[PDB]
Design a protein around this nucleic acid. Structure first.
Ligand SMILES: [Zn+2]
Ligand SMILES: [Zn+2]
Ligand SMILES: [Zn+2]
Ligand SMILES: [Zn+2]
Lengths: 202, 201, 202, 200
DNA sequence: CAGGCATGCCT
DNA sequence: AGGCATGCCTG
DNA sequence: AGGCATGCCTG
DNA sequence: CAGGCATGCCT
């Protein structure tokens, strides 16, 4: 039904949906990085970062893959994650684009991209047709872009979000799903090291 | 008109279970649950998420209600409302569309209906039952408690109980669970002390 | 002739104007106690409080004195001081009443006690004509009653207030002004001594 | 006139800008550091300013407030709110005053918000009112709707608030200004401003 | 009356 | 987090 | 009131 | 590339 709070629970369905991360250079300031322990991606804004998709049984036709952001804390979950006023109106980055300025998550390099603004739930998300890994390849890598900092005032300001990747049936039914925390910042590694470090303190 | 609504655990046919996820244990915490006790400690107006589990729900008309009642039998015959201060107040009454007078509110859903029993007098919030999402076990509801357990003019220092019932389109309880509730500025503090004292009398 | 921000400044005009307080009991449960150190009095909700007023020379015919509350902090200086939503209606002490339960300051005994609401500034004040001191007795004494505790939610909650006594003509201008911090509380003595002693830890 | 003067002009009647005693506490709403004519306040909190004039002015006189970046290069830029604070709803809603304006007046229903046709400059004006009986000060309540640090607006670019009085006619009478700093902790900010100024 | 607690809220 | 406010309840 | 959290800056 | 600073904000 018209679900207002997307659910974020790893649910490898009939096929075995999997979300993995490409090799990543550790550093305070690097395009991106991932924390297997804390299950959360660290990413400079607007820059490129690829996610790995793997499956066993090749999924049914018309099958797609969505990406949606949601706030981690309950106090804020009823709020849809959109871009901040600062970055949305600014031309600095999106005037020649084909994706709506307000959307947080953009897909890079794929014209088949579909930017969804649900009429009822107001939830924004980007979807693409699903496709098998290039011959002799283990993963179907999709290139995502995040257009605001987890700190952006007026947008997701300093409140952690969760990036939900959903494997969907053409009609929208759910075939798979994985989730993980995301943080768009200025210096990823550093925020990670510190976060991994602190985690270890307790 | 009198009611003293029943607060009797009835897991019912469809296995019903309103549970709680892990909340923090901070002096001031939006909310926190004491598995030890039947108490849910939370801050006023905050989002206290509650989990519902069910194995096989069927009525299309089945919906769920939450209604506040006083614990001590002396007052249970008294309707549980909002103090005059928070009702006429401007704070969480401007904007949101819910009755200024109710204590319980559903936060993330607009299908909710706030009902004022014409005879009972009781006030409660009802929302349609929507099953868990593909791959998720619980149907999560978001609740808001508009007054402090301690507000004079309202329930002043009177332990209260929230009763969640899963009824069929028309008054027929498919089951219910109940828990004690305290609304305060500092939930963490009150639990450490509450659970504490309760042990070794 | 309406000002948005009543002045709290004292003003001993042509007629010498001074407002004094009779002997103050130190008891904690005491109905009221005045502090000349802090120039601040402590009351209990709706308890009779004598305010001794004095003039060096007698004033015009129908001139009066008005008691208008005002906040101490600028952050709030604009909020007209009114009775807490709760009290502005609870029937204890209005079914008795003759005055708008909205009004905070009000007199006891005098049936010539008038009230005012500038439709311009919406200010709530009380007015009573200068009846010469009890002939032979220096000060004229008006019995006041302050309806809400300084900590009442919905009203001045825990926000300090100034009690302004203004010497006015039958009309026209102002003729004498004396302000002093107000405070409605349960235990005036308790409170009085606590403030009063902290001022000593300067 | 685009890019106006901050120059001090006491005037026929002596116009003086004064700040009552403020707090020295870190999170105090506002404070003033006499050492450096600089006002520290919090976004949207009530900044009161004491205005004393020697003699009573004409019937059409009034007081206006206008922000102006400090540094040479930036002065040419109009001082408006960042986009986030302008579109965010925190205060804008129900507020009957332009949402782009940095400066706001609080206690007046006769606040006149101005946007210059040629200049584009923004400012708030209020008809002057004589100090009240026995009061040596005429008080105006001012709000500053954007931290100085904000992007999309003052990029941590210092500004001065030039307060001038003018006739009913568009004519200047007196002028005085002081640097402004909108922040979270006024107390802290100044206490630090001075410590380092005490070095050379 | 005066001590003292429960519980909101401030730095 | 630790600690102060402050109404109200004893006794 | 102290300490943190986080974009930009510096070398 | 990481260390440090300035500035909003949390317990
Ligand atoms: Zn942004
Ligand atoms: Zn209440
Ligand atoms: Zn009251
Ligand atoms: Zn801003």
């Amino acid at each position: 039904h018209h679900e207002f709070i997307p659910s974020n629970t790893d649910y490898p369905g009939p096929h075995h949906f999997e979300v993995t991360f490409q090799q990543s250079s550790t550093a305070k300031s690097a395009t991106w990085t991932y924390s297997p322990l804390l299950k959360k991606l660290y990413c400079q804004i607007a820059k490129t970062c690829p996610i790995q998709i793997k499956v066993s049984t090749p999924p049914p036709p018309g099958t797609a893959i969505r990406a949606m952001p949601v706030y981690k804390k309950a106090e804020h979950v009823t709020d849809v994650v959109k871009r901040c006023p600062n970055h949305e109106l600014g031309r600095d980055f999106n005037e020649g684009q084909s994706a709506p300025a307000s959307h947080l998550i953009r897909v890079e390099g794929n014209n088949l991209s579909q930017y969804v603004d649900d009429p009822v739930t107001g939830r924004q998300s980007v979807v693409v047709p699903y496709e098998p890994p290039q011959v002799g390849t283990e993963f179907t890598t999709i290139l995502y872009n995040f257009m605001c900092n987890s700190s952006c005032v007026g947008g997701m300001n300093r409140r952690p979000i969760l990036i939900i990747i959903t494997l969907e049936m053409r009609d929208g039914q759910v075939l798979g799903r994985r989730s993980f925390e995301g943080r768009i910042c200025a210096c990823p590694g550093r925020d990670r090291k510190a976060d991994e470090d602190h985690y270890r303190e307790q």
